Design an enzyme around this catalytic site. Sequence first.
Site, short mmCIF file in Angstrom:
data_model
loop_
_atom_site.label_atom_id
_atom_site.label_comp_id
_atom_site.label_asym_id
_atom_site.label_seq_id
_atom_site.Cartn_x
_atom_site.Cartn_y
_atom_site.Cartn_z
N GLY A 1 49.77 42.37 38.58
CA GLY A 1 49.56 41.17 39.19
C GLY A 1 49.60 40.11 37.96
N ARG A 2 50.18 38.83 38.46
CA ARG A 2 50.42 37.75 37.16
C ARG A 2 50.12 36.58 37.90
N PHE B 1 46.88 31.82 34.48
CA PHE B 1 46.01 31.94 33.68
C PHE B 1 46.28 33.47 32.91
N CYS C 1 47.28 38.07 33.21
CA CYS C 1 48.24 38.97 33.73
C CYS C 1 47.38 40.35 33.67
CB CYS C 1 49.42 39.12 32.85
SG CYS C 1 50.60 40.27 33.79
N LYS D 1 43.74 43.62 31.64
CA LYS D 1 43.79 42.03 31.87
C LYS D 1 44.03 41.26 30.79
CE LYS D 1 41.57 38.07 33.93
NZ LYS D 1 40.21 37.43 34.52
N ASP E 1 31.66 33.19 45.73
CA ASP E 1 33.13 33.53 46.58
C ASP E 1 33.27 34.76 47.12
OD1 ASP E 1 35.61 33.06 47.43
OD2 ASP E 1 36.50 33.26 45.41
N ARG F 1 39.00 39.16 50.20
CA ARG F 1 40.13 39.27 49.17
C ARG F 1 39.52 39.53 48.00
NH1 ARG F 1 39.09 33.94 50.83
NH2 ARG F 1 37.83 32.90 49.38
N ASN F 2 38.11 39.41 47.64
CA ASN F 2 37.54 39.65 46.38
C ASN F 2 36.73 40.91 46.22
OD1 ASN F 2 38.14 37.34 44.47
ND2 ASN F 2 36.49 36.23 45.79
N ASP G 1 35.37 39.46 41.78
CA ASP G 1 35.68 38.14 42.04
C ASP G 1 37.18 37.95 41.11
OD1 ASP G 1 36.07 35.44 41.82
OD2 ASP G 1 34.14 34.93 41.32
C1 LIG Z 1 31.53 38.76 36.74
C2 LIG Z 1 33.18 39.09 36.87
C3 LIG Z 1 33.81 38.78 35.83
C4 LIG Z 1 35.44 38.97 35.96
C5 LIG Z 1 35.74 39.81 37.04
C6 LIG Z 1 37.11 39.98 37.08
O1 LIG Z 1 37.99 39.60 35.89
N1 LIG Z 1 37.66 40.62 37.98
C7 LIG Z 1 38.91 41.22 38.29
C8 LIG Z 1 39.27 41.49 39.58
C9 LIG Z 1 40.73 42.15 39.64
C10 LIG Z 1 41.47 41.71 38.83
O2 LIG Z 1 42.64 42.50 39.07
C11 LIG Z 1 43.04 43.73 39.68
C12 LIG Z 1 42.34 44.71 39.07
C13 LIG Z 1 42.60 45.85 39.65
C14 LIG Z 1 42.33 47.07 39.36
N2 LIG Z 1 43.14 48.03 39.85
N3 LIG Z 1 43.98 47.32 40.43
C15 LIG Z 1 44.80 47.97 41.51
C16 LIG Z 1 43.94 46.19 40.05
C17 LIG Z 1 44.69 44.98 40.75
C18 LIG Z 1 44.27 43.81 40.52
C19 LIG Z 1 45.08 42.71 40.66
C20 LIG Z 1 44.99 41.50 40.21
N4 LIG Z 1 45.94 40.53 41.00
N5 LIG Z 1 46.63 41.44 41.68
C21 LIG Z 1 46.16 42.72 41.89
C22 LIG Z 1 41.08 41.46 37.46
F1 LIG Z 1 42.25 41.51 36.48
C23 LIG Z 1 39.99 41.11 37.28
C24 LIG Z 1 34.84 40.11 37.96
O3 LIG Z 1 35.36 40.59 39.10
N6 LIG Z 1 33.40 39.66 37.83
C25 LIG Z 1 32.68 40.08 38.99
C26 LIG Z 1 32.21 39.33 39.98
C27 LIG Z 1 31.35 39.66 40.91
C28 LIG Z 1 30.89 40.93 40.94
F2 LIG Z 1 30.06 41.33 42.02
C29 LIG Z 1 31.42 41.83 39.97
C30 LIG Z 1 32.31 41.46 39.04
#
Ligand SMILES: Cc1ccc(C(=O)Nc2ccc(Oc3cc4cnn(C)c4cc3-c3cn[nH]c3)c(F)c2)c(=O)n1-c1ccc(F)cc1
Length: 283
Positions: free
Chosen positions: A41-42, A45, A47, A66, A160, A164-165, A178
Site C-alpha cells: 500500500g502506498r 506519507f 509506503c 513501512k 480511531d 478499517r483499523n 491504526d
Molecule cells: C501505536 C501505533 C503506531 C503505528 C501503527 C502503524 O504504523 N500501523 C500500521 C498499520 C498498517 C500498516 O499497513 C499494512 C501493514 C500490513 C501488514 N500486513 N499487511 C498485509 C499489511 C498491509 C498494510 C497496508 C497498509 N496499507 N494498505 C495495506 C502499516 F504500515 C502500519 C499502529 O498501528 N499503532 C497502533 C495503534 C493502536 C494499536 F492498538 C496498535 C498499534
Amino acid sequence: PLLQNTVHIDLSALNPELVQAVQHVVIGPSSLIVHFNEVIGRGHFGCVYHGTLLDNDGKKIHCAVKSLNRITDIGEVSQFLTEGIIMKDFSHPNVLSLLGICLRSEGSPLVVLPYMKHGDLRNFIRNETHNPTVKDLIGFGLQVAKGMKYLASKKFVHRDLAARNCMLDEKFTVKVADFGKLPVKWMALESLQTQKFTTKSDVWSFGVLLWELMTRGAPPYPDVNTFDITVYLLQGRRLLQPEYCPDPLYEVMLKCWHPKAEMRPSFSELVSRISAIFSTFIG
Ligand SMILES: Cc1ccc(C(=O)Nc2ccc(Oc3cc4cnn(C)c4cc3-c3cn[nH]c3)c(F)c2)c(=O)n1-c1ccc(F)cc1
C-alpha cells in the site's frame, strides 16, 4: 549528485531517549530483504512493502516493511520513529506489535511489522468469497474487545477504533491497529462537541465497530451527511439493529452509545458479556 536515496539522518538531532528506545528493537540490514517491487500500500506519507526477515536460525519470516517516501526534515523522522516505538510497549495477541526498526546508513528508517495475510478487517468481511458466519463476526468483535481491554489497562486511548483499523492474520487473529481530519461517524457525542477522547469514547467507537461487523462492513449512517451527525445523536437517535444481529449484542451496542460517558460499560465488562454471547450462539 546526491539523491533522495542518499539521505543521511542525524540521530544526534533526536531525543536520546528515542534513539535508545529504538536501540532495543534494531534489526540489522543484513537480516532484512525488502521486496521493493511488491508494494502492499502506498500513501503520500509512506509506503508499505512485502519483506523477508531472517530469524536467528536463518529461517525466512514474511513481514510488512513501512518506509517514509521523500524525507525532507528531521521532525518527519522523529514522528515516524516515535509511532513505531509506542508499539514496542504492546504485547497482546489482539494488538498489533512491531518486529523491529531497521535504519541503514542512508535512506528512510524502516518499521518492520508482522505480515497480516487477510489484510484489514472491514475489507475481509465485505468479501463475498469470505462471507463470514454470524458466529465468526461475533468472534471478531470479542477479539477486538480483548485487545481494547488490554490497551485500556495501559491507559492508551486509541482515538480511531474502526474495522478499517483492525487487521487479520493467517490464523484469523484480529489485531487492533491504526493505519494513521476526524472519523466523525465513529466518534462519541462528547468528542464531536469538545474534541476530547477518552477510553469511554473508545467504547462508543467499539460499539460502532460491532455494528460494522454485524452489517458485514456497511457504512454507518449512510443517509446522514458528516455535518449532520451531531444533530442526529443529540436527538437520541442511534444506529439501528442490523438484520441477523442477535438482540443481546444490539443491547451491548446501545450501551456503548450512552450519552453519559461514565454509564458506558468498561472493556472488561464488554469482554465478559460478548464472551457470554459468543458461547451461547451456536453456529
Ligand atoms: C501505536 C501505533 C503506531 C503505528 C501503527 C502503524 O504504523 N500501523 C500500521 C498499520 C498498517 C500498516 O499497513 C499494512 C501493514 C500490513 C501488514 N500486513 N499487511 C498485509 C499489511 C498491509 C498494510 C497496508 C497498509 N496499507 N494498505 C495495506 C502499516 F504500515 C502500519 C499502529 O498501528 N499503532 C497502533 C495503534 C493502536 C494499536 F492498538 C496498535 C498499534
